[PDB]
Design a protein around this ligand. Sequence first.
Ligand SMILES: NC(=O)C1=CN([C@@H]2O[C@H](COP(=O)(O)OP(=O)(O)OC[C@H]3O[C@@H](n4cnc5c(N)ncnc54)[C@H](OP(=O)(O)O)[C@@H]3O)[C@@H](O)[C@H]2O)C=CC1
Ligand SMILES: NC(=O)C1=CN([C@@H]2O[C@H](COP(=O)(O)OP(=O)(O)OC[C@H]3O[C@@H](n4cnc5c(N)ncnc54)[C@H](OP(=O)(O)O)[C@@H]3O)[C@@H](O)[C@H]2O)C=CC1
Ligand SMILES: CN(Cc1cnc2nc(N)nc(N)c2n1)c1ccc(C(=O)N[C@@H](CCC(=O)O)C(=O)O)cc1
Ligand SMILES: CN(Cc1cnc2nc(N)nc(N)c2n1)c1ccc(C(=O)N[C@@H](CCC(=O)O)C(=O)O)cc1
Lengths: 164, 164
Amino acid sequence: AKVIFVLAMDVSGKIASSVESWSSFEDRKNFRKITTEIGNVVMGRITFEEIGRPLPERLNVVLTRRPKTSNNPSLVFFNGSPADVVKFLEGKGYERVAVIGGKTVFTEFLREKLVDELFVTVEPYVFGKGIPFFDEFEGYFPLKLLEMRRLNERGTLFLKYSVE
Amino acid sequence: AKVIFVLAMDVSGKIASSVESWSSFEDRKNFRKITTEIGNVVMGRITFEEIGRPLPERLNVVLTRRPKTSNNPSLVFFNGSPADVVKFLEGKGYERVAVIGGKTVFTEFLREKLVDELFVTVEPYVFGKGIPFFDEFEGYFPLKLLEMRRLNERGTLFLKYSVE
Ligand SMILES: NC(=O)C1=CN([C@@H]2O[C@H](COP(=O)(O)OP(=O)(O)OC[C@H]3O[C@@H](n4cnc5c(N)ncnc54)[C@H](OP(=O)(O)O)[C@@H]3O)[C@@H](O)[C@H]2O)C=CC1
Ligand SMILES: NC(=O)C1=CN([C@@H]2O[C@H](COP(=O)(O)OP(=O)(O)OC[C@H]3O[C@@H](n4cnc5c(N)ncnc54)[C@H](OP(=O)(O)O)[C@@H]3O)[C@@H](O)[C@H]2O)C=CC1
Ligand SMILES: CN(Cc1cnc2nc(N)nc(N)c2n1)c1ccc(C(=O)N[C@@H](CCC(=O)O)C(=O)O)cc1
Ligand SMILES: CN(Cc1cnc2nc(N)nc(N)c2n1)c1ccc(C(=O)N[C@@H](CCC(=O)O)C(=O)O)cc1
């Protein structure tokens, strides 16, 4: 399956800050549309706790070293490496895997080179402080821009890159 | 005069990395046009050394605490706050000031809220390590997207933002 990263950030590359509601209405609807199409989302435990509940119409895979039994078929607490995660979803018939976050989770998939496309939303802000897209890692990735789209009047931008 | 930031970065927000030749010539020509139109470039001493010499047809203002007299009329070593630099250039009839870089210089101008527009080029890469656009500072800036332009088939993107 191909791995797709889905994230929103400010112009400086941060995925979280203390700025209230900087995430646009448009990015939120675009996010639901994209991830439901893919049919699954892989996230870190901390990101799951912030969302608070499983996202509807999608298989929610939550990474945690303290797996918890689940009563919901669309919620799975998983203890494994990025590679293990991809194998598990592939075994479910998914062609694409949507990794939606946790700086920690983005970092792990990057260190392991498991990323084929980046669906990036750039919100019109500059945050002086915040949580970076990922922690330092050796190497880099050349990209190719597949699509660019303005999502609203203020300038929220949706970019789609393929990893070369 | 209004302060304009001109920078190129990868998708993760870094203005420099160990990767060779990641700067596109299209960005370089676009940079040449914009900065010569503005007529001046304000930069940190390190950036100056890396460029290798005064950029032609532009007043080059090199920020430094250890000032050196200059023979060249279009090269000035300046010691002072970002506010003093603007004052100095305004006194010379400039309406716009082009701050072209150095993580330290961008940080200083941001801390002082002296910035009106951002002329940002996003090169199609993700760097694992590198120098960030700026070091932490208090607050943030909401922006409005004025213009978006693709510079090459690979995906180099030029974005123009207004502050606040
Ligand atoms: N702007 C955006 O688009 C997004 C922003 N975010 C933001 O980023 C922050 C979250 O980032 P971050 O805290 O780094 O990461 P996460 O919070 O998403 O998850 C961290 C945790 O996930 C678990 N985990 C990670 N990797 C593995 C693995 N290989 N195996 C098992 N468990 C694993 C661990 O859980 P345990 O401790 O249980 O063992 C770890 O504590 C939040 O502020 C959130 O708002 C999140 C998504 C998107
Ligand atoms: N991608 C891009 O668009 C750009 C990338 N860069 C990259 O970023 C790096 C440069 O970042 P960084 O080193 O932080 O900064 P700079 O290299 O631009 O400048 C550092 C210097 O500027 C001087 N300086 C800074 N603030 C002041 C002040 N308030 N008053 C007086 N002098 C001051 C100091 O001079 P002194 O010590 O002599 O007194 C210091 O040595 C380089 O690797 C370069 O390649 C640079 C520009 C653009
Ligand atoms: C905090 N968080 C993480 C979050 C937010 N925006 C993002 N935006 C992008 N582009 N990418 C991400 N990974 C991302 N992650 C959240 C919080 C809520 C919902 C959420 O309610 N979900 C609805 C969205 C729908 C709405 O507002 O209709 C969904 O069903 O997908 C998703 C993610
Ligand atoms: C390392 N450096 C800093 C540099 C490079 N690209 C950037 N690109 C952007 N968008 N913004 C910056 N601040 C920036 N800074 C350099 C190195 C050379 C020249 C340079 O030769 N100058 C010619 C360009 C000429 C060409 O290729 O015709 C110029 O007249 O501006 C400029 C900046």
